[PDB]
Design an enzyme around this catalytic site. Structure first.
Site, PDB file in Angstrom:
ATOM      1  N   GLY A  30       0.877  -1.108   0.132  1.00 48.85           N
ATOM      2  CA  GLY A  30       0.130  -0.083  -0.066  1.00 48.85           C
ATOM      3  C   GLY A  30       0.828   1.242  -0.018  1.00 48.85           C
ATOM      4  N   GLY A  32      -0.215   6.104  -0.401  1.00 50.13           N
ATOM      5  CA  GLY A  32      -1.004   7.093  -0.188  1.00 50.13           C
ATOM      6  C   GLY A  32      -0.606   8.294   0.688  1.00 50.13           C
ATOM      7  CB  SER A  33      -2.320  10.554   2.906  1.00 49.23           C
ATOM      8  OG  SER A  33      -2.852   9.323   3.759  1.00 49.23           O
ATOM      9  CB  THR A  34       0.308   8.028   6.662  1.00 47.83           C
ATOM     10  OG1 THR A  34      -0.332   7.003   5.928  1.00 47.83           O
ATOM     11  CG2 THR A  34      -0.751   8.631   7.396  1.00 47.83           C
ATOM     12  CB  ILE A  36       5.504   2.873   1.705  1.00 50.78           C
ATOM     13  CG1 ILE A  36       6.424   2.510   2.705  1.00 50.78           C
ATOM     14  CG2 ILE A  36       5.828   3.975   0.706  1.00 50.78           C
ATOM     15  CD1 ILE A  36       7.889   1.851   1.980  1.00 50.78           C
ATOM     16  CD  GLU A  98      -4.930  -8.885  13.654  1.00 49.51           C
ATOM     17  OE1 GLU A  98      -5.183  -7.679  14.445  1.00 49.51           O
ATOM     18  OE2 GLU A  98      -5.432 -10.038  13.928  1.00 49.51           O
ATOM     19  CG  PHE A  99      -0.508  -9.743   7.068  1.00 45.59           C
ATOM     20  CD1 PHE A  99      -0.755  -8.476   6.116  1.00 45.59           C
ATOM     21  CD2 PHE A  99      -0.518 -11.116   6.409  1.00 45.59           C
ATOM     22  CE1 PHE A  99      -0.849  -8.875   4.773  1.00 45.59           C
ATOM     23  CE2 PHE A  99      -0.555 -11.128   5.323  1.00 45.59           C
ATOM     24  CZ  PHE A  99      -0.836 -10.047   4.203  1.00 45.59           C
ATOM     25  CG  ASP A 142     -10.450   8.469   6.470  1.00 43.20           C
ATOM     26  OD1 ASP A 142     -11.052   8.955   5.591  1.00 43.20           O
ATOM     27  OD2 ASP A 142      -9.440   7.815   6.026  1.00 43.20           O
TER      28      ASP A 142
HETATM   29  C1  2OL Z   1      -5.266  -4.521   1.505  1.00 42.27           C
HETATM   30  O1  2OL Z   1      -3.959  -3.849   1.399  1.00 42.27           O
HETATM   31  C2  2OL Z   1      -4.391  -2.616   1.271  1.00 42.27           C
HETATM   32  C3  2OL Z   1      -2.844  -1.822   1.905  1.00 42.27           C
HETATM   33  N1  2OL Z   1      -2.727  -2.213   3.099  1.00 42.27           N
HETATM   34  C4  2OL Z   1      -2.671  -1.372   4.262  1.00 42.27           C
HETATM   35  N2  2OL Z   1      -2.704  -0.194   4.110  1.00 42.27           N
HETATM   36  C5  2OL Z   1      -2.846   0.457   5.454  1.00 42.27           C
HETATM   37  C6  2OL Z   1      -2.836   1.595   5.978  1.00 42.27           C
HETATM   38  C7  2OL Z   1      -3.184   1.722   7.245  1.00 42.27           C
HETATM   39  C8  2OL Z   1      -3.318   0.746   8.154  1.00 42.27           C
HETATM   40  C9  2OL Z   1      -3.228   1.239   9.575  1.00 42.27           C
HETATM   41  C10 2OL Z   1      -3.733   1.142  10.830  1.00 42.27           C
HETATM   42  C11 2OL Z   1      -3.819   1.344  12.151  1.00 42.27           C
HETATM   43  O2  2OL Z   1      -4.307   2.858  12.326  1.00 42.27           O
HETATM   44  C12 2OL Z   1      -4.838   0.522  12.743  1.00 42.27           C
HETATM   45  C13 2OL Z   1      -5.064   0.724  14.220  1.00 42.27           C
HETATM   46  C14 2OL Z   1      -3.683   0.278  15.014  1.00 42.27           C
HETATM   47  C15 2OL Z   1      -2.586   1.210  14.273  1.00 42.27           C
HETATM   48  C16 2OL Z   1      -2.410   1.146  12.963  1.00 42.27           C
HETATM   49  C17 2OL Z   1      -3.209  -0.457   7.711  1.00 42.27           C
HETATM   50  C18 2OL Z   1      -2.717  -0.741   6.277  1.00 42.27           C
HETATM   51  N3  2OL Z   1      -2.793  -2.142   5.576  1.00 42.27           N
HETATM   52  C19 2OL Z   1      -3.165  -3.132   5.931  1.00 42.27           C
HETATM   53  C20 2OL Z   1      -2.718  -3.542   7.220  1.00 42.27           C
HETATM   54  C21 2OL Z   1      -2.764  -4.919   7.638  1.00 42.27           C
HETATM   55  N4  2OL Z   1      -3.232  -5.809   6.614  1.00 42.27           N
HETATM   56  C22 2OL Z   1      -3.431  -5.403   5.549  1.00 42.27           C
HETATM   57  N5  2OL Z   1      -3.839  -6.367   4.654  1.00 42.27           N
HETATM   58  N6  2OL Z   1      -3.351  -4.014   5.115  1.00 42.27           N
END
Ligand code: 2OL
EC number: 2.7.11.1
Length: 291
Positions: A30, A32-34, A36, A98-99, A142
């Site tokens: 992923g 975007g804003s914040t 990678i 967490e993934f 959001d």
């Molecule tokens: C499906 O994949 C899309 C891109 N992945 C992705 N972008 C993220 C942006 C922010 C957060 C975020 C966040 C938090 O704000 C959530 C609460 C704890 C602090 C971090 C998590 C993202 N992910 C994740 C993360 C884990 N698994 C998957 N598949 N994609």
């Protein structure tokens, strides 16, 4: 002095040490804003995690990072993406979490049609999460399909608290213009003091996504769309014919212009529509590698 001041602030809330010592095999998923977002392996356990990397010198609001880390610093809910640790790696902030192997809900609403059992299951999960989050004075700010991640067995988890805020008995409302234009609540767009209710509206807009495939005014520019949301009445489902009275009744409790009249997470959990909600197994056939 400003930048170096923020680094010093982080070091009081982030875990010490260099996580690169125990993390390997980074793979970007992923952006975007914040910054990678990558996934990586922990060498001691072989476990998989997701790592969000945010460069401090590239933020429109550097303080929004602090909020996210100190506020979610091991909050723990069945329906929220769990944070493991945070680190300061050079000029970058690392949030290890967490993934979620199932991906984002955005992929589902743009490729398939969800039935009401599957829509109710998503809503039920989001509401259970928000009821607790709101009960502790935390506003996501959001809520949308991008902020909803899934597991392999179809379990829903609220994600991306990069915009979240904290309110209290003393400061019960926020003022800053935060979120994604199309999902924004009217009282938030009109630059007014708002509370947790702005999430219930956005949840409403996300319900539209699950039915129409996209939010209202999605064809318009961001600025023009916001002005439309500001001035107009609540938006209408393009596929109103496809939804049941139950859902329609439910949705009407979310997209209320008056935030005071708009329902709350704790109330909505008791809605007859959520009885339609099915097991996490029902979400499974919708995922990309099953359909
Ligand atoms: C499906 O994949 C899309 C891109 N992945 C992705 N972008 C993220 C942006 C922010 C957060 C975020 C966040 C938090 O704000 C959530 C609460 C704890 C602090 C971090 C998590 C993202 N992910 C994740 C993360 C884990 N698994 C998957 N598949 N994609």
């Amino acid at each position: 002095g400003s930048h170096e001041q923020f680094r010093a602030a982080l070091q009081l809330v982030v875990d010490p040490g260099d996580p690169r010592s125990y993390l390997d095999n980074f793979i970007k998923i992923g952006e975007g804003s914040t910054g990678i977002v990558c996934i990586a392996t922990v060498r001691s356990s072989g476990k998989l995690v997701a790592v969000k990397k945010m460069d401090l010198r590239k933020q429109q609001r550097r303080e929004l990072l602090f909020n996210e880390v100190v506020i979610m610093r091991d909050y723990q809910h069945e329906n929220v993406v769990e944070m493991y640790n945070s680190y300061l790696v050079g000029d970058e902030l690392w949030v290890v979490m967490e993934f979620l192997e199932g991906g984002a809900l955005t992929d589902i609403v743009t490729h398939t049609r969800m039935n009401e059992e599957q829509i109710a299951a998503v809503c039920l999960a989001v509401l259970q999460a928000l009821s607790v989050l709101h009960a502790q004075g935390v506003i996501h700010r959001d809520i949308k399909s991008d902020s909803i991640l899934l597991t392999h067995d179809g379990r829903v988890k609220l994600s991306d608290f990069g915009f979240c805020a904290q309110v209290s008995k003393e400061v019960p409302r926020r003022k800053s213009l935060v979120g994604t234009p199309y999902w924004m609540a009217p009282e938030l767009i009109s630059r007014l003091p708002y509370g947790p209710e702005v999430d219930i509206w956005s949840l409403g807009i996300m319900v539209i996504e699950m039915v129409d495939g996209e939010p209202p005014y999605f064809n318009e520019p961001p600025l023009k769309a916001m002005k439309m949301i500001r001035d107009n009445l609540p938006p209408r489902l393009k596929n109103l014919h496809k939804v049941s009275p139950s859902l329609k009744g439910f949705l009407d409790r979310l997209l209320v212009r008056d935030p005071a009249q708009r329902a709350t997470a704790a109330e909505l959990l008791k809605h007859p529509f959520l009885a339609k909600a099915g097991p996490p197994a029902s979400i499974v056939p919708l995922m990309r590698q099953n359909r």
